[PDB]
Design a protein around this motif. Structure first.
Motif, mmCIF file in Angstrom:
data_model
loop_
_atom_site.group_PDB
_atom_site.id
_atom_site.type_symbol
_atom_site.label_atom_id
_atom_site.label_comp_id
_atom_site.label_asym_id
_atom_site.label_seq_id
_atom_site.Cartn_x
_atom_site.Cartn_y
_atom_site.Cartn_z
ATOM 1 N N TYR A 88 0.801 -1.244 0.000
ATOM 2 C CA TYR A 88 0.000 0.000 0.000
ATOM 3 C C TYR A 88 0.827 1.286 0.000
ATOM 4 O O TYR A 88 0.254 2.376 0.085
ATOM 5 C CB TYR A 88 -1.007 0.037 1.156
ATOM 6 N N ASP B 215 -4.531 12.530 -3.756
ATOM 7 C CA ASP B 215 -4.498 12.367 -2.311
ATOM 8 C C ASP B 215 -4.446 13.713 -1.595
ATOM 9 O O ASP B 215 -4.995 13.848 -0.510
ATOM 10 C CB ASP B 215 -3.267 11.551 -1.883
ATOM 11 N N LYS B 240 -9.522 12.056 -4.000
ATOM 12 C CA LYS B 240 -10.024 10.692 -4.239
ATOM 13 C C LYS B 240 -11.325 10.382 -3.509
ATOM 14 O O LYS B 240 -12.200 9.709 -4.031
ATOM 15 C CB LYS B 240 -8.970 9.638 -3.840
HETATM 16 CA CA LIG Z 1 -2.563 5.491 -1.366
#
Ligand SMILES: [Ca+2]
Ligand SMILES: [Ca+2]
Ligand SMILES: [Ca+2]
Ligand SMILES: [Ca+2]
Lengths: 338, 338
Positions: A88, B215, B240
C-alpha cells in the motif's frame, strides 16, 4: 477489479468496525501503520498516528488478529505486516526563552501545587505549556490591561497570568478548592491584588458579575461534544461582546476528525464565532497515570510506561464577532441557535 | 453614562465607517493603535495589527483627521493619541535545518525562475516558506508515495515536492506557461519523471483524469469568498474521497475576520470538510512591488518601501471525511450543498 485487487485494507477495516463505533476509514489504519513504522512504543504510536486512542487499540488488535503485528517486543510488524505496508506504499511517519524569568518563577511556585486527584479528573499541562500559552495570548493582544476568565484551572494558568503582570483582573472558577486556595496564596506572594475566585453552579444561568464581563476566557474542557458546548457556550457568554477571545484545547487523542467536524460546526453555526488559530500539539500534558488506566496498557504483554509526555492537545483560539452568542442561561440538550 | 464617558472610540469608529464598507469594530482601531505603539513603519503596522490593509489605512486616516496620529515621521501618535491609548489601556503589540539540502537545491533551481508578472497576478512565498510547506505536509503524512495536485504554482512548490523525492506523482496547472515550462525543465534536471502539466478550463467541469484522482491538493487562491469557493471547491473535487488533504493560504492582510467566518462556514457547511490546522503567518511572501500599488503608499508624505517581507498569510489544512464534497462541474453563484 474486486476479484484480484488486494482485499487486505477492506478486511482490516471491517474487523476494526466490530470493535468500536468510532468511524473507521482506511486512512485510520494507514495512520497507525505509518506510526508503527516509526516506533514500537504504543504511546508514541498513538501520538504519531493522531487517531483516537480507542480506535488505535482497536486497529492494533485487528492487525494482530489478522497476522500483521505482534506485541511480543513492543509493537512491531510481522513479515506479513511488512508486506502490507510495502504493497500500500505506506511510509514511516516523520515529525519562550525571552520570558525565562516567568518560567523560573512559575516552576518555583507550582513545585508545591496540590497533588492531581482522579476525583476531580485532574490532568494538567507542563510549566512550559502554561508559559507558552501566556506568550501566545499576549501576541494576539488578549492579556495586557484585559479582564481574563479562567474556567477550570488545574493548569494554574492564573498563576502564570499573575506573574506576567499583564491582565487588569483575573477571575477563576474551579471545582477543586485546593486549587483556588493555592491560587489565592500565590496571588498574595506575587502581590497581585486583582484576582477573584468565582464559586457558582455552571449548570445554572450565569450571574450578572460573570455575564458579559470579560475580554478573554480560557478553558480546557472534557473531550465530548456535550462538554465542549457547555464549557465554550458558557465561556462565550462571559465575553463582553464582539472581538473578545476564547482559548481551549481539543485533542486528537480522544476525538476523531468526524468529532472535530461536529465541534467546528457548533462553533460556527451554534455560537457563530470565528476560529483564528488551530495549533497542533501546542498543549503537552504531564503524565498523570492515565496510560495505565487505558486499554492500551493491557495490549502489550510486558507493561511499559510512557517515556515522555505522549498526551497532547491542539490549541484553538476563537474570536467573537457581530452576532456571536453563547449560553447565558440553561445549557440546552441540542443546538438552539442553529 | 453616555454624557461623561469617553466618546473617543465611538467617534473614531463612526469616521472609519464613512471610508470603508469593511465591518469596523472598536477593536479594529485598538489593534491599529497597538501596532502604532510598536512601530512607526506602515507596513509593520498593517502586519502587527492583523487587520486588512484598506481598513488599516481608513483607520489611520480617521485617527489623523481627528488629531491622534501624524504622518510627518513615519506613523506616530500625537500627544492626543498618547492620551487616547493611556485612557483605553491599549498596550504595545508584542510578537527546516534537517532539510537543508532541499533548501540549497531549491534556491539553486529557482534563482533563474521566470520574473513575476503583474499580468498573471503573481506573488510568491520565500524559498524558506516553500520548503517548510513540504516539511509540514510530510509531517501530516500527505506526501510520501502520494498523488499531489498543485492548482496554480507561482510558488514553485512542485519543484520542492520533486526535490523531496516523496510524492508518487505530481500534477500542476498554471495559467502562466513560463512556469509550467520551467517546472518541466526542472523535472528533467532533477530526474523526476512523474510530473504532469494539466491545461484545462477551470470554469468547465473537471475532466475524468483530474476528477477524484489525488491524495493531496495545494493552492493559494485570491482573497475573495468567490475565488476561494472556486479554488477550494475545485481542489476538493480532485480528491479521491474521504481522508484526503487540502492546503491553502488565507490572509489577514486582505480578509477581515468577518470574511474568515464566511470562509469557514463555506468549508464546513458547503464542502462539509474539517479544518485540522490554521497556522498564523506560516506563508511569507517575497516583496513583489505590491506595497507601492496600495493606498498605504500614498498615506505617508515621505515614501518608504517595506524593510522586510510584511505580507503574510495563514496556512489552512483541511481533510475530507464521509460526506465531504467539492465542485465537480459548474461553479455555482451561491451555496448549493448548504
Ligand atoms: Ca494510497
Ligand atoms: Ca485539565
Ligand atoms: Ca478594554
Ligand atoms: Ca501566488
Amino acid at each position: 477489479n474486486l476479484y484480484f485487487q488486494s482485499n487486505a485494507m477492506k478486511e482490516i477495516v471491517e474487523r476494526v468496525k466490530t470493535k468500536t463505533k468510532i468511524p473507521v476509514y482506511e486512512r485510520s489504519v494507514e495512520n497507525v501503520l505509518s506510526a508503527v513504522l516509526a516506533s514500537d512504543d504504543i504511546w508514541r504510536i498513538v501520538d504519531l498516528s493522531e487517531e483516537p486512542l480507542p480506535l488505535v487499540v482497536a486497529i492494533l488488535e485487528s492487525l494482530n488478529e489478522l497476522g500483521y503485528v505482534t506485541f511480543e517486543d513492543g509493537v512491531k510488524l510481522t513479515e506479513k505486516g511488512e508486506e502490507l505496508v510495502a504493497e500500500y506504499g505506506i511510509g514511516k511517519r516523520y515529525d519562550l526563552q525571552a520570558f525565562a524569568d516567568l518560567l523560573e518563577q512559575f516552576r518555583e511556585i507550582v513545585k508545591d501545587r496540590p497533588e492531581p486527584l482522579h476525583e476531580f479528573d485532574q490532568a494538567y499541562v507542563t510549566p512550559e505549556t502554561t508559559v507558552a500559552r501566556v506568550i501566545l495570548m499576549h501576541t494576539r493582544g488578549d492579556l495586557e490591561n484585559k479582564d481574563i476568565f479562567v474556567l477550570g484551572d488545574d493548569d494554574l494558568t492564573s498563576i502564570a497570568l499573575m506573574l506576567s503582570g499583564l491582565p487588569k483582573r483575573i477571575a477563576v472558577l474551579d471545582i477543586d478548592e485546593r486549587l483556588t486556595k493555592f491560587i489565592e496564596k500565590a496571588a498574595n506572594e506575587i502581590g497581585y491584588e486583582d484576582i477573584e475566585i468565582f464559586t457558582f453552579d455552571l449548570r445554572k444561568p450565569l450571574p450578572d458579575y460573570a455575564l458579559h464581563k470579560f475580554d478573554t476566557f480560557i478553558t480546557d474542557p472534557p473531550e465530548t461534544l456535550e462538554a465542549i458546548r457547555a464549557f465554550v457556550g458558557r465561556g462565550i457568554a462571559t465575553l463582553k461582546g464582539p472581538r473578545c477571545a476564547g482559548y481551549f484545547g481539543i485533542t486528537r487523542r480522544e476525538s476523531s476528525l468526524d468529532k472535530w467536524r461536529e465541534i467546528q460546526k457548533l462553533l460556527l453555526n451554534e455560537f457563530n464565532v470565528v476560529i483564528t488559530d488551530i495549533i497542533r500539539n501546542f498543549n503537552e500534558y504531564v503524565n498523570w497515570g492515565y496510560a495505565e488506566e487505558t486499554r492500551a496498557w493491557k495490549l502489550i504483554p510486558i507493561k511499559k510506561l510512557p517515556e515522555y509526555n505522549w498526551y497532547k492537545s491542539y490549541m484553538f483560539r476563537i474570536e467573537t464577532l457581530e452576532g456571536s452568542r453563547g449560553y447565558e442561561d440553561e445549557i440546552p440538550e441540542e443546538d438552539i441557535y442553529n
